[PDB]
Design a binder for this molecule. Structure first.
Ligand SMILES: O=P(O)(O)O[C@H]1[C@H](OP(=O)(O)O)[C@@H](OP(=O)(O)O)[C@H](OP(=O)(O)O)[C@@H](OP(=O)(O)O)[C@H]1OP(=O)(O)O
Lengths: 56, 118
């Protein structure tokens, strides 16, 4: 925004440069994918296999 | 009743890896992910069993024992006041060399109780 709102261009909304935040949130997904695949796999495996009482 | 001791433990062989891998579950911990998947082995300088096999241990042990014993050897106005010198020959009385197998009469515990209670 400091580079965007420099001269005659004011301080309205008017700024879609979503590439930076887009990269930031996709690099979040890059690492959250194993964690959520493991967590959702255990969720589905407990729902369809049952809970093991004193197994571990 | 409710509050009771054990008098026998729980036996193993009936859960998660015991006979049929508990019939092949699809549940796994985060502590069960791959980690340290490579056994490190002893190198030639460390203590590899090729080097340990030919070694005479008694001569080297006696030499290190001799060197340790040699190191331990080479290491080692108002005259009118109503009370005179009360400590004449008290040359610090080596309590800090003694070690006592008693948690109530130890030196560390006496220092502890001297420090932490006023
Ligand atoms: O109100 P300020 O502290 O001066 O800062 C605001 C605030 O952004 P910050 O998070 O940096 O404070 C606004 O964000 P909101 O949290 O209010 O949504 C933002 O507007 P948008 O983020 O909605 O675009 C706006 O930007 P601008 O007013 O330049 O359009 C920006 O103002 P400054 O850039 O003057 O700090």
């Amino acid at each position: 925004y400091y580079r965007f709102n420099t001269g005659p261009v004011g301080k309205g909304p008017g700024c879609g440069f979503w590439a930076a935040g887009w990269r930031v949130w996709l690099f979040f997904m890059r690492g959250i994918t194993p964690l959520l695949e493991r967590w959702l796999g255990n969720l589905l495996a407990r729902q369809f296999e049952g809970r093991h009482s004193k197994g571990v | 009743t409710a509050a009771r001791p054990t008098f026998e433990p729980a036996r193993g062989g009936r859960g998660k890896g015991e006979g049929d891998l508990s019939q092949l579950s699809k549940q796994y911990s985060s502590r069960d992910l791959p980690s340290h998947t490579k056994i490190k082995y002893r190198q030639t300088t460390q203590d590899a069993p090729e080097e340990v096999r030919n070694r005479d241990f008694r001569r080297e042990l006696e030499e290190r024992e001799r060197a340790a014993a040699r190191e331990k050897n080479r290491d080692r106005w108002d005259d009118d006041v109503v009370f005179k010198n009360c400590a004449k020959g008290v040359d610090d009385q080596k309590k800090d060399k003694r070690f006592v197998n008693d948690t109530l009469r130890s030196e560390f515990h006496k220092k502890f109780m001297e420090k932490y209670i006023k």
